[PDB]
Design a protein around this ligand. Structure first.
Ligand code: CL
Ligand code: CL
Ligand code: CL
Ligand code: CL
Ligand code: K
Ligand code: MG
Ligand code: MG
Ligand code: MG
Ligand code: MG
Ligand code: MG
Ligand code: MG
Ligand code: MG
Ligand code: MG
Ligand code: MG
Ligand code: MG
Ligand code: MG
Ligand code: MG
Ligand code: MG
Ligand code: MG
Ligand code: MG
Ligand code: MG
Ligand code: MG
Ligand code: NA
Ligand code: NA
Ligand code: NA
Ligand code: NA
Ligand code: NA
Ligand code: NA
Ligand code: NA
Ligand code: NA
Ligand code: SR
Ligand code: SR
Ligand code: SR
Ligand code: SR
Ligand code: SR
Ligand code: SR
Ligand code: SR
Ligand code: SR
Ligand code: SR
Ligand code: SR
Ligand code: SR
Ligand code: SR
Ligand code: SR
Ligand code: SR
Ligand code: SR
Ligand code: SR
Lengths: 194, 56, 237, 92
RNA sequence: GCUUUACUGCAGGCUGUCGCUGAGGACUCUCACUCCGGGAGGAGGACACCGAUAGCCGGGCA
RNA sequence: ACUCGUACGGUCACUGAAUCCUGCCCAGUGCAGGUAUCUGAACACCUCGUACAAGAGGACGAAGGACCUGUCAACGGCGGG
RNA sequence: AAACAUCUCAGUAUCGGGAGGAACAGAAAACGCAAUGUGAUGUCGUUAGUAACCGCGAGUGAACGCGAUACAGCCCAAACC
């Protein structure tokens, strides 16, 4: 039979219809009055969080982060540039907003490590994502068969090096064949042409 | 009044001093910032790749 | 070229800032719950550095000492009232709705409770014309008919210090002293007198703006100089 | 100059002399789907667009004849070198 | 370095459109959103701000 | 920032104390206003095309321009016969 | 590029953040010597200055495969409890 979770999932396929639509209209009013990174005791999208590795356990944290919508907030050149390098308006950054969200969340909790994150909507001027963070120092996690892997030293500050699921996607690592000639094993090893 | 010798006599202000963190006489006592190691500006130590030839 | 003076202003460096640390207070109306049960006694008359006009120090019943934007005719000892039921007399503050049509008012609020925005300069005054349950009509000093919420508070009488502008400065030194009390860079070097690099009008053998002065509203800063979006110029016609 | 609308001449198709009708070549309409069209959209962006920022060249004082010669019996046309002519009017 | 109706572009301003954005070629409303208010509450209101894009101007800048 | 500021303000420019004065010109250029009609992009819409799409065309048309008006203490001009 | 705007120099110099002893990658929604075929991923040799790009100018420039090195494959979400 269908899991209760499937229902949360199905509601979020069309956040603009049904009860969910009404919920968002209500919630966002409060979110707009909240800070940049708000820790929350429970994921707004349980199914999604559990699917990404979330667990109701000690050392598991969830935080919502909001980021301004739009392209790059860039300053026009103050020195000589050929027409090609004078652009300012239509230039966009290479990291998607979800990634910027994961990094701000991780800065807020220096001791925690980003596990994954997912979207929870947006209005006209900002986007919200919830980020799952894990405490690599808590024994309840050090003893977890599904999460202890994130306790290894080489996982420290994983988000800042693009090791996140959103990080790997944004780096063009999804495809294993055609089109990934310059993304794998890293953007840098491939001269930064990916 | 020339910008040269005559203007040099007006110089009796103490700015750069012995830095507590690095020991160089680069701690600007007015700005409270060391121009050599960055003390007062950053926890990290002031450093730049242009301080040496590019391939070295 | 280089940024023009108008652009240096925006950065708000000392050269362009007002001597705020020397200013006294912001003559905003008092806030009363309701009833008008607020009256104070004019304890003194002072000079307001930011406006070159006099200000009245008042001591209210509830024990609050605050400077007020004084109209002409207020003196020490006098008693002032602030509230809906305030008596209709010079120096008193109350919502337009309570003021009788045809009465000169000053320090008029733009939005009920903001403290006063209009007609605060020397010897000026707004003229309350039409009354209503939805809109109070006031003729501002510029001659413009302004539509305000009848709830906007105001003070009866014209602002003190009228006629200040009738006497010429006569000398640069006098202008100097006044300018030193404002957020203004003075004296003024003409654009035509500068180098091309410094202003749209700079350059050329003899001084002259090698271009029409009437500039478009859409012009970017650095270029918007001279006669901004003029509907006309000169005295003719 | 004057030009007869029809006249006998060699038809490279029938491979023999037959009556032909002369017509000025009318410009065919573009589709906007040629490779060059796609290259312009791909290579134009912020700033100068190289060849795609260039504008139409000039004109020669006189243009060369640009006609179609259609065989009155097989319906097929053939082209020929053109010759400079200030004006070209057909007779009949 | 400087100039301009040199070439080519870039900011910036104006303007349409899409998203924010709701209810009943002109209209009403309130619930988002904005503003005033210490507060209650008042004003405004699906506009404005903001994100995107399109046309015009654009030696202010390269 | 201006601004503890509010048109007797403060921003942008020109001329340069007082005194006597400051003519004619709105065609070009600039600014501003208006504008039946003309022109004027994208999205949505419509037709053709494509089992879809590319694409071609249409209808609607904002600012802007055409056009009209105002303005020279606005750029400037006041000749030859 | 014998000027120069796309292109080039070059994702180079330089800047911000971050981990380790090495990093990163990694058990196919792959490949497509099209097959009755290969079988995670780096890297090395080659494929090759080939395909592809480009005021189709100057210039830029892979991949599959193959020969090697080393080899290793697993854990969740959900269903049912
Ligand atoms: Cl992390
Ligand atoms: Cl003054
Ligand atoms: Cl012809
Ligand atoms: Cl194979
Ligand atoms: K270059
Ligand atoms: Mg298990
Ligand atoms: Mg590597
Ligand atoms: Mg005040
Ligand atoms: Mg001063
Ligand atoms: Mg001057
Ligand atoms: Mg000079
Ligand atoms: Mg200039
Ligand atoms: Mg002059
Ligand atoms: Mg506010
Ligand atoms: Mg230039
Ligand atoms: Mg002069
Ligand atoms: Mg002089
Ligand atoms: Mg060259
Ligand atoms: Mg390049
Ligand atoms: Mg060449
Ligand atoms: Mg390259
Ligand atoms: Mg391949
Ligand atoms: Na962290
Ligand atoms: Na790429
Ligand atoms: Na391209
Ligand atoms: Na020079
Ligand atoms: Na004229
Ligand atoms: Na050369
Ligand atoms: Na050169
Ligand atoms: Na090229
Ligand atoms: Sr760290
Ligand atoms: Sr001197
Ligand atoms: Sr001397
Ligand atoms: Sr000294
Ligand atoms: Sr500091
Ligand atoms: Sr450094
Ligand atoms: Sr105020
Ligand atoms: Sr106030
Ligand atoms: Sr000049
Ligand atoms: Sr006149
Ligand atoms: Sr492109
Ligand atoms: Sr372009
Ligand atoms: Sr010619
Ligand atoms: Sr005079
Ligand atoms: Sr005119
Ligand atoms: Sr193997």
């Amino acid at each position: 039979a269908r899991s209760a979770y499937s229902y949360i999932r199905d509601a979020w396929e069309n956040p603009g219809d049904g009860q969910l639509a009404e919920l968002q209209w209500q919630r966002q009013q409060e979110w707009r009055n909240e800070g940049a990174v708000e820790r929350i005791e429970r994921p707004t999208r349980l199914d999604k969080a559990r699917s990404q590795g979330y667990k109701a356990k000690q050392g598991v944290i969830v935080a919502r982060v909001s980021v301004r919508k739009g392209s790059a907030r860039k300053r026009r050149h103050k020195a000589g540039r050929r027409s090609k390098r004078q652009g300012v308006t239509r230039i966009t950054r290479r990291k998607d907003i979800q990634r910027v969200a994961e990094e701000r969340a991780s800065r807020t909790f220096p001791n925690l490590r980003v596990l994954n994150s997912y979207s929870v909507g947006q209005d006209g001027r900002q986007k919200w994502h919830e980020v799952i963070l894990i405490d690599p120092n808590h024994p309840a996690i050090q003893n977890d068969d599904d999460l202890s892997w994130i306790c290894a030293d080489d996982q420290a500050d994983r988000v800042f090096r693009g090791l996140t699921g959103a990080g790997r996607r944004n780096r063009g690592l999804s495809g294993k064949g055609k089109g990934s000639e310059k993304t794998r094993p890293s953007l840098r090893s491939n001269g930064g042409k990916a | 009044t020339g910008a040269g010798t005559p203007s040099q006599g007006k110089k009796n202000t103490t700015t750069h001093t012995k830095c507590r963190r690095c020991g160089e006489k680069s701690y600007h006592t007015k700005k409270k910032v060391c121009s050599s190691c960055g003390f007062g500006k950053s926890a990290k130590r002031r450093d730049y790749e242009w301080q040496s030839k590019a391939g070295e | 070229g280089r940024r023009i003076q108008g652009q240096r202003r925006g950065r708000g460096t000392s050269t362009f800032r007002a001597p705020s640390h020397r200013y006294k207070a912001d003559l905003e109306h008092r806030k009363v719950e309701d009833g008008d049960v607020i009256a104070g006694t004019v304890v003194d008359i002072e000079h307001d550095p930011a406006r070159s006009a006099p200000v009245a120090a008042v001591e209210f019943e509830d024990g609050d000492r605050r400077l007020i934007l004084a109209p002409e005719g207020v003196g020490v000892g006098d008693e002032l009232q602030v509230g809906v039921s305030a008596e209709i007399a010079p120096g008193n503050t109350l919502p337009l709705a309570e003021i009788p049509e045809g009465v000169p008012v000053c320090n008029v609020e733009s939005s009920p409770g903001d403290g006063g925005k209009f007609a605060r300069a020397s010897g000026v005054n707004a003229q309350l014309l039409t009354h209503d349950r939805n809109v109070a009509v006031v003729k501002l000093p510029s001659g413009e008919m302004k539509r305000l919420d009848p709830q906007c508070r105001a003070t009866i009488g014209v602002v003190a210090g009228g006629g200040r502008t009738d006497k010429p400065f006569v000398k640069a030194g006098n202008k100097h002293h006044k300018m030193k009390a404002r957020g203004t860079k003075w004296p003024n070097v003409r654009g035509v007198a500068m180098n091309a690099v410094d202003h749209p009008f700079g350059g050329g053998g003899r001084q002259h703006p090698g271009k029409p002065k009437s500039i478009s509203r859409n012009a970017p800063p650095g270029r918007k100089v001279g006669d901004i979006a003029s509907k006309r110029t000169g005295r003719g016609g | 100059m004057q030009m007869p609308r029809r006249f006998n001449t060699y038809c490279p198709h029938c491979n023999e002399h037959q009556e032909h009708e002369v017509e000025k070549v009318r410009s065919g309409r573009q589709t906007g789907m040629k490779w060059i069209d796609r290259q312009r959209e791909r290579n134009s962006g912020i700033g100068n667009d190289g060849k795609f920022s260039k504008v139409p060249g000039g004109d020669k004082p006189t243009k060369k004849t640009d006609l179609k010669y259609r065989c009155g019996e097989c319906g097929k046309a053939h082209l020929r070198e053109g010759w400079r002519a200030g004006r070209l009017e057909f007779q009949e």
